[PDB]
Amino acid sequence: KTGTAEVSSILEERILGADTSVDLEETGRVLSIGDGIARVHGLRNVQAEEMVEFSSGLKGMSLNLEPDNVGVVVFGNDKLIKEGDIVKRTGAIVDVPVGEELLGRVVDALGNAIDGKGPIGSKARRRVGLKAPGIIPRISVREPMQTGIKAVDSLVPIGRGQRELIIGDRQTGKTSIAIDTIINQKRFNDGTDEKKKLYCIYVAIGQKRSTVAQLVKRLTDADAMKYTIVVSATASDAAPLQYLAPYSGCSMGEYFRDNGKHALIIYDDLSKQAVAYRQMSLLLRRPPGREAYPGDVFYLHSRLLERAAKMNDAFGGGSLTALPVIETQAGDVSAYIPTNVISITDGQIFLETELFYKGIRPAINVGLSVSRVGSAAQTRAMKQVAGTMKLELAQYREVAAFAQFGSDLDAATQQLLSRGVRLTELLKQGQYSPMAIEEQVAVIYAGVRGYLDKLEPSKITKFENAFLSHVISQHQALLGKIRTDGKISEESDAKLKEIVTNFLAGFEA
Amino acid sequence: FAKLVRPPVQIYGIEGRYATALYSAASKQNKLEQVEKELLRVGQILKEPKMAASLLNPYVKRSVKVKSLSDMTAKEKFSPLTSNLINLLAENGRLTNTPAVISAFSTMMSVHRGEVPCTVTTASALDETTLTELKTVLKSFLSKGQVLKLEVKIDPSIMGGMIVRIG
Amino acid sequence: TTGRIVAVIGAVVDVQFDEGLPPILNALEVQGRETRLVLEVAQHLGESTVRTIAMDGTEGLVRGQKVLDSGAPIRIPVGPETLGRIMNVIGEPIDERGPIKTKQFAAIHAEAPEFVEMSVEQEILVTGIKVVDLLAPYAKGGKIGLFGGAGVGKTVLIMELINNVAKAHGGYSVFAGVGERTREGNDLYHEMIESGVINLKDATSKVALVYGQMNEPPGARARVALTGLTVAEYFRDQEGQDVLLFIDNIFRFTQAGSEVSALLGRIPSAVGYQPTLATDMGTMQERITTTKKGSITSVQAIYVPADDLTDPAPATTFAHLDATTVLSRAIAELGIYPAVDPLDSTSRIMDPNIVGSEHYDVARGVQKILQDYKSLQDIIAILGMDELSEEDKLTVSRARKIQRFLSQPFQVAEVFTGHLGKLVPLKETIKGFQQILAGEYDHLPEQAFYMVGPIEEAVAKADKLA
Amino acid sequence: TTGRIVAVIGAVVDVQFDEGLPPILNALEVQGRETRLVLEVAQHLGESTVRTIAMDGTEGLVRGQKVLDSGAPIRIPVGPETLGRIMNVIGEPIDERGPIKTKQFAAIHAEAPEFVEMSVEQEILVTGIKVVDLLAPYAKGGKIGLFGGAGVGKTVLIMELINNVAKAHGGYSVFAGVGERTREGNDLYHEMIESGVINLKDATSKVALVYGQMNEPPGARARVALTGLTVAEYFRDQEGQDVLLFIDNIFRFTQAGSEVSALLGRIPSAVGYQPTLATDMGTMQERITTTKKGSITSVQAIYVPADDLTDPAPATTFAHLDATTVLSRAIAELGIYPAVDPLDSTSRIMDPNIVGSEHYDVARGVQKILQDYKSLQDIIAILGMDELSEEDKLTVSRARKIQRFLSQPFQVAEVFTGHLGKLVPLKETIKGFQQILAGEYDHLPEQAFYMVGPIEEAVAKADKLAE
Predict the structure, then answer these.
(1) D287, D322, D349 — which closes off a domain?
(2) How many CB atoms sit inside 10 A of residue C256's CB?
(3) Where are the beta strands (DSSP E) in D120-216?
């Protein structure tokens, strides 16, 4: 600024004051350009954070309203442009297309196809620049919500509207898991309780197309894509795009939320997003901070996440359940933003690879995993069996305590350990394994009531599949019932037991 | 925007980033010289405080400092784009800096085609020289002046020290 | 005076003010804003350009907007008419119940009580959580800093404290939700409604809420604190009311500040932490006392940054504390609700004079054992189940009893803990432990002490199985 | 359009163009530097000045000098004649046998191919080497990063793979020796030459070599990456080919980027990085793929600085991969080559499905045992033994056999090893370890398992090792 236009060309005419007179106000000439940062001279009158439009067609946005020029993050190329290029105002900040036809659709973060399903239709467009709802506008989470993963639904019993951190490592199947959850939502979407229909928004944040491609392919396979947006900021992305993607997502899901719908956004992951943004700030020489990160990216997110909610029905009728993902790298949440984030959600979900290495998908460090919420995010159902199990794993862990000290100190515990092992078997949960609760509790019940202590741990699982098919086939009645009861009923138990015993008996013998 | 035009000297820009504007500006429209003289004038037209010292006084509002220092006065016949650049250096506070732009400038239509080599005493004395021919010698002859020991010395001009300098 | 938007680069707004720069902290009102867009003047850059801070919403702002200075800081409603009402920083409802009908206005700053203005009164108040009384005495005017696991203990505790207190102590509370999670406020709300101590039919709530939430600029989040202070100063000074000032999170303030220092161009102190971190605090704590009229005892949530304290920020904080409750996650993990790090749920205060001399002593016995107990524990990580050199085991176990006994089930967490409420009236507490020191619990085994109210109930519970 | 070099601060060449600036990225030919000095426009610095980058170095430049835009970005020779050649960025004969006469030219730029135009979900390319496939099976056309400290036989190992595999592979391959020791490349060359796969009689080979050695000025090293890409892309799609893309080392590439980042007047980053690292990569890695038109299985050697992975750059890196070979410096340090940390070298691509469960499971048990086994290792390490559990002992030992069983010596490089110990076709692999799972072997040695091939023979060796 202090050089440019103090030096000629630019300056060289301002002198006269003849140079459109000046204008460049609803126009700009690219003052300097390099590298997706169009310092654009002019655009002078501008809104704040206006998305502007390029002579290369393209967008960039005038975030930085400087008194001279506009720091424009150009969301892309520099090989198009060469300086002085005309930037025409749009007078307008971003709002993003939103709609419900995005359900069934993979778009880029532009909310434009990449799907190669031709184009999407854009019904609505809706602000990304839209704030979070209010207290009363929210009615807190009531629901449960099944990922179809006993462990998950049990130990983090999730409702909807809920902001909750998914955290876990590098392609560790975590994402597989995340998919499986998503797969689970299918049944609800094949169900008809809208309130159990969770519209999935998979924000792919900086996640390379190839990586998307299989994955999407997987979604295709699940067909569940039909109620699913895949908001796609792949790795290739211009940073503002990757960056942008959540806010975009944010407009759409709140929309759903507000359209009564219970929306789910999977942000995978903001760790990357942040890089992109940070990078963006920093490039603007809007300097870094802790962990090189400048800090109101948190505000960005805090606010972002404040936009995820469970609406008071009078106030929205729906939910946007936010399942952010931060993919930890070495489980690292020392990671600034994780430290922050830890401070942000109403629990966070810890994954432990080791279980994974043990084979055990899931990975979980349950001990560290939390839904503080838990129960607001649940139902009667699970609690009746699960409480004890959690506790019992506490015990199991406890004798792993005394595996920080030891291997044997009680008979009981030789049993308890046995029991513990049993509980472990159940917690091995395949990837691509979406469930209904009744199964989840079902499978829990025998063992947690001891009757699977009576079996080879490896075979528990075997039982379970088999068992499942048994009831499915047989006790379909019941399955209807437990499902009816939305809980485990005395009847169901007893009958369950009876079944169980028979099944158990057939499996065990 | 424009395209590069720079009178001989020419310069480096930078407090002459303006100069260079007018090394294209003045140059173009070729009131090159009009302003060339303007500048000269300005120099002392400048030099006395007043509505100028005004700036110094931070608390005088630049806004109206321009409308005073340049309104009635610096447009006294300094205007074309000249008041506007005044009013630019004005804004851009490059007013205390302005002399140097003139300096910089003024080696411009004349001195634009200056004389450089660094030469003992009152060395070169910006003129004009044509590199194909010698011009050097001539000059020297003209004078049998300068100071050359006090002024530039037999060490440069012919190493008084060097014989010392080997050891 | 008037300003011009000349540049907005994020919430750092340079306004070139078109006229006289009045003092800083002047709230400027942006014209061309269909919001109450307060800017706080931040620096007089000179030639009437200020660096100002946006606290309100953006994206749309004209480079050229018009700013009209309120010429002073914000004036915001202060006075009792805030009770019930959930006001944001701007004193404006966010109760969504419409007006907050104080007709007294205030600059959100306030002054720092002089040396004489210490009506600071050196003694414990109580609200029945065992552990507290026991370890860390209470203060009239005092800042107690509560560290730990929000919404799993720290917050949870706060809420209980809130729960017992507002009712029990008359002299109100102020809650300033600094970067509050709307959601938690939602929840809280519903709890408050439910509890009805947020009186609304009679806005005679025993609590005022001031919120400067997550979805707000740091500037916004930062200032709700001052505001809240101003308000509370009303209740103390004016209303006598012995406010409990619940802050969640001063840390979120801290954050807002910290980013801000940078953004202000400015240098921040260590680790990036705003260098004025302390002064903000300092002055603010100095904008506290027990005045003659009242007491503002502050109850402070501190996101224990990285659960670190060593951490300069909490390092600073400590200077201002009158009690600190540092939870021990191990303890939280140890179940124990309360989830204490008792050794650091501390108060410099406590003395056999200050508390019961007994109290003190009993406590000293406890503090002692616990110190020691750890030492033994170290052997146990490498050397036991429930057996070593038994006397020594005994102390361990007792320490466990004590431990267990510290666990005080909590009603608000019949949901969270799964466990219902217990409040242990103080003697019953002291007696409880004092007895443990007296060790009759031998006759009575240990474990049942885990999560009980008075010590007996554990006895009942044990016996029924023995 | 012409510029004159106005500021040279190193090979960051500031050219002030005195008129029109072509868009950023134009390859410029400097008018004077016959030392074919391509400047790539990097920035339009403003006021018709660009920051351009010398690929090259600079000594002798007069501040002044005229630069003439080469009017495009780099045009490079492409097509098959680059096979069996050493190309640099500009495809010059570092074969040093004269040109790499092509038809085709290229902007060394290429972008990410459409997502739909990719193949969506790939199918396993088995990796031969028992340990390797087993724990990390790859995808045909996959991007594998081999994290590993270079030069630990790291490099040797890749070569050996090449040996096994690239040999075993038909299609074509692209080899990029970036930043690596010219000396090793020299030998390698001759070795390929020798191999005659670097055909001494085909301009082609089946493999094209592209080099961006360390001793170069950065741009050259940096940009050879795009180049190599362009070619391989050329072959992949155009030649429809199953390309193998060998990169040694992306690390030096990344480093090259980072190094400049500062100089580029940008901020460097954490650790000094290129803060654009991600975008660079994202876009780049996405330039990479196996589309439908061909497949590039890209084996990308990754020097990992101080083996710090944690170290953000590698932290990033991971995204780009879908198979990681994480070498354990410790294991390598045990001489044990295989040296990998395989509970760190990963593919989710191992499957009960794709890899069938047997393999898979056998692996899961393995991964497991080992994973547990390390955990103690340390404890016990100082905490010695027995007042314990000896079933653990069994696993420990077993783990150790297995451990050793992963080891296969550097077959070929008898110069380094003197040892052979072969490759294990996959069923035999599964079998091998599975048999150890059957633990029959267990009264047997440990180094029997060390540096071999087929478990049968290993067993044979066990017996033999038992004298």
Answers:
(1) D349
(2) 29
(3) 124-125, 138-139, 143-147, 172-178, 207-212
Q: Is D151 known as a binding-site position?
A: yes
**Cβ contact D367–A172 (<8 Å):** no
Same domain? For D424 and D341 the reply is no
Distance from CA of D190 to the nearest CA of A (A): 36
Contacts of C190 (CB under 8 A, 6+ apart): A139, A140
Rounded to whole angstroms, how far apart are CA atoms D371 and A174? 19
Other beta carbons less than 10 A from residue C399's beta carbon? 20
Pairing label, strands D66-72, D2-9: antiparallel
Q: A with D: how many residue pairs have Cβ under 8 Å apart?
A: 180
Nearest by Cα to A133 from A347, A276, A388, A308? A308
Task: Give the other-Cβ count within 10 Å of D437's Cβ.
Answer: 18
- The answer to whether the beta carbons of residues A370 and A351 sit under 8 Å apart is no
Question: Based on the number of CB atoms within 10 Å of its own CB, is C64 exposed (0-12), middle (13-18) or buried (19 or more)?
Answer: middle
Resolved by: cryo-EM
Task: Give how far B80 is from chain D: nearest CA, Å.
Answer: 24
Domain residue limits at C116: 74-349
DSSP string, D45-71: EETTEEEEEESS--TT--TT-EEEEEE
CATH architecture of A23-92: Beta Barrel (2.40)
Is D180 known to sit in a ligand binding site? yes
Find the DSSP H helices in A307-431: 336-342, 353-358, 380-401, 411-427
Q: Write the burial class of residue C393 (CB in 10 Å: 0-12 exposed, 13-18 middle, 19+ buried).
A: middle
Kindly list the domain boundaries of chain A, sorted by start residue: 23-92, 93-378, 379-509
* Residue carrying the six token digits 């620049």: A129
Cα separation, A261 vs A266, whole angstroms = 16
- Distant-in-sequence, close-in-space partners of B67: CB < 8 Å, separation ≥ 6: none
- B14/A contact by beta carbon, under 8 A: yes
As a whole number of angstroms, the distance between CA D271 and CA D249 comes to 19
Which positions in chain D touch B16 (Cβ < 8 Å)? none
How far apart, in whole angstroms, are the C-alpha atoms of residue D405 and residue D429?
Answer: 10
Residue range A93-378, CATH number: 3.40.50.300
Q: List the structure tokens of A202.
A: 């998979």
Helices C357-381 and C426-438 meet at what angle, rounded to 10?
Answer: 50
Give the CATH H-level superfamily of domain A379-509. ATP synthase alpha/beta chain, C-terminal domain (1.20.150.20)
Alpha carbons C220 and C406: distance in angstroms, whole number: 39
Active-site residues of D, by number, are: 154, 180-181
Amino acid at the residue D284: M
A307 is an active site residue? no
How far, CA to CA in Å, does C395 sit from each of C114, C217, C250, C381, C448? 49, 52, 39, 16, 17
DSSP D115-135: STTB-SS--EEP--SHHHHHH
- Rounded Cα–Cα distance for residues D409 and D211 (Å): 28
- Give CA–CA dist A166/A312, Å, rounded: 25
* CA pair distance A140, D462, nearest whole angstrom: 66
Q: Does residue D156 have a known ligand-binding role?
A: yes
Contact criterion met (CB below 8 Å) for A494 and A500? no
Which residue, among A208, A1, A229, has the nearest Cα to A100 in the 3D structure? A229
Strand partners of residue A264: A200, A321
Residue C181, min C-alpha distance to chain A (Å): 7
Contact assessment for residue D154 and residue D416, using Cβ atoms and an 8 Å cutoff: no
Cα angle B130, B132, B138 (rounded to 5 degrees) comes to 60
Resolution in A: 7.4
